[PDB]
Amino acid sequence: AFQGMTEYKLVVVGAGGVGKSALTIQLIQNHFVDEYDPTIEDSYRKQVVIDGETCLLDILDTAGHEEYSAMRDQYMRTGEGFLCVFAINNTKSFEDIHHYREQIKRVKDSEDVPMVLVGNKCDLPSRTVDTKQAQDLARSYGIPFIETSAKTRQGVDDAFYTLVREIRKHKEK
Ligand SMILES: Nc1nc2c(ncn2[C@@H]2O[C@H](COP(=O)(O)OP(=O)(O)NP(=O)(O)O)[C@@H](O)[C@H]2O)c(=O)[nH]1
Ligand SMILES: COc1nc(-c2cccc3c2OCCO3)ccc1Nc1ccc(CN(C)C)cc1
Ligand SMILES: [Mg+2]
């Protein structure tokens, strides 16, 4: 029997200040947060319909810098898919993406972990990471790339829905 909607555990990772929380709060509350309040760890839930299937998204919003290693390993083991977020005006956040991805692959002991590359703050004028560079990186990993703005809401739904589609593909192989 059906016992309730399918649940997906999604984790949002990336460097300090790239907009992890702003993306999530835009999804959950349709609200843009202008303030920068560094996260420790926050948990959100949302019911949505993606490709005709109702599902419950359990979303973990993480700290940019994870001081304490055992807590970080736990959410990497529990997460089924990961949004790897950088900011298109912060080159260093883009270079850090490779490190997040390697850490997740190591902890899950798998080459094929559902992931989406997210280039956030695409509303800002001071772009230092080119779209083409980000697409190349994502193509090298075999994952989708999406440009977002937590401010304008561009790509916000798409980033999360695309990640659910990646998790579904991985569960049906
Ligand atoms: N213009 C613009 N600013 C953004 C965007 N996304 C986030 N911001 C801003 O960037 C700052 C940090 O965003 P926040 O969500 O707190 O980042 P975080 O990645 O969760 N930081 P931490 O890792 O410490 O929790 C905030 O001032 C926020 O308004 C965006 O898409 N466009
Ligand atoms: C415990 O279940 C949850 N687990 C996670 C979660 C997702 C991915 C990785 C993780 C996670 O958790 C810790 C370890 O690693 C997120 C939300 C809830 N749950 C949740 C969140 C918010 C509400 C809304 N409620 C506060 C009003 C309800 C359920
Ligand atoms: Mg945050």
Numbering used by the authors: -3 to 169
Give the article text.
Here, we employ the intracellular antibody to identify a compound from a chemical fragment library that binds to RAS proteins adjacent to the effector binding region. High-resolution crystal structures show the binding of this compound to mutant RAS, and this structural information facilitates hit to lead development. Our structure-based approach has produced compounds that bind to mutant KRAS with sub-μM affinity that interfere with RAS-effector PPI and endogenous RAS-dependent signalling in human cancer cells, and show a correlation between in vitro binding and potency in the cells. Although, various RAS inhibitors have been described in literature,24–32,47,48, in this paper we describe an approach for the development of RAS-effector inhibitors by combining different elements i.e. (i) the hit identification via a method of intracellular antibody fragment competition; (ii) structure-based design via crystal structures (KRASQ61HGPPNHP) and NMR (waterLOGSY and CPMG); (iii) identification of clear structure-activity relationship (SAR) for the development of potent compounds against KRAS and (iv) the proof of concept in mechanistic and phenotypic cell assays.
The RHS of Abd-6 was removed to reduce the molecular weight, but to maintain or increase the interaction with the protein. The new analogue, Abd-7, gave improved crystallography results with full electron density for the compound and with van der Waals contacts to K5, L6, V7, S39, Y40, R41, D54, I55, L56, G70, Y71, T74 and G75. Abd-7 was found in five out of six protein chains. Interactions to residues from a neighbouring protein within the unit cell were also identified, same as Abd-6. The initial fragment compound (Abd-2) was improved by introducing pyridine functionalities to position 8 of the benzene ring from the benzodioxane moiety, enhancing the Kd from μM to nM with increased ligand efficiency values from 0.26 of Abd-2 to 0.34 of Abd-7. Abd-2 has no effect on the BRET signal over a range of 5–20 μM, while Abd-7 reduces the BRET signal at 5, 10 and 20 μM for all of the RAS-effector PPIs tested. The mechanism by which Abd-7 interferes with RAS-effector PPI is indicated from the crystal structure data. The binding of the CRAF, RALGDS and PI3K effectors to RAS is similar and very close to the binding site of Abd-7. In Fig. 6, RAS with bound Abd-7 is superimposed to structures of RAS-effector complexes showing that the terminal tertiary ammonium group, and adjacent phenyl ring, of Abd-7 overlaps with the bound effector structures. The competition effect of Abd-7 on the binding of the effectors with RAS in cells, can therefore be interpreted as steric hindrance of the lower affinity effectors by the higher affinity Abd-7.
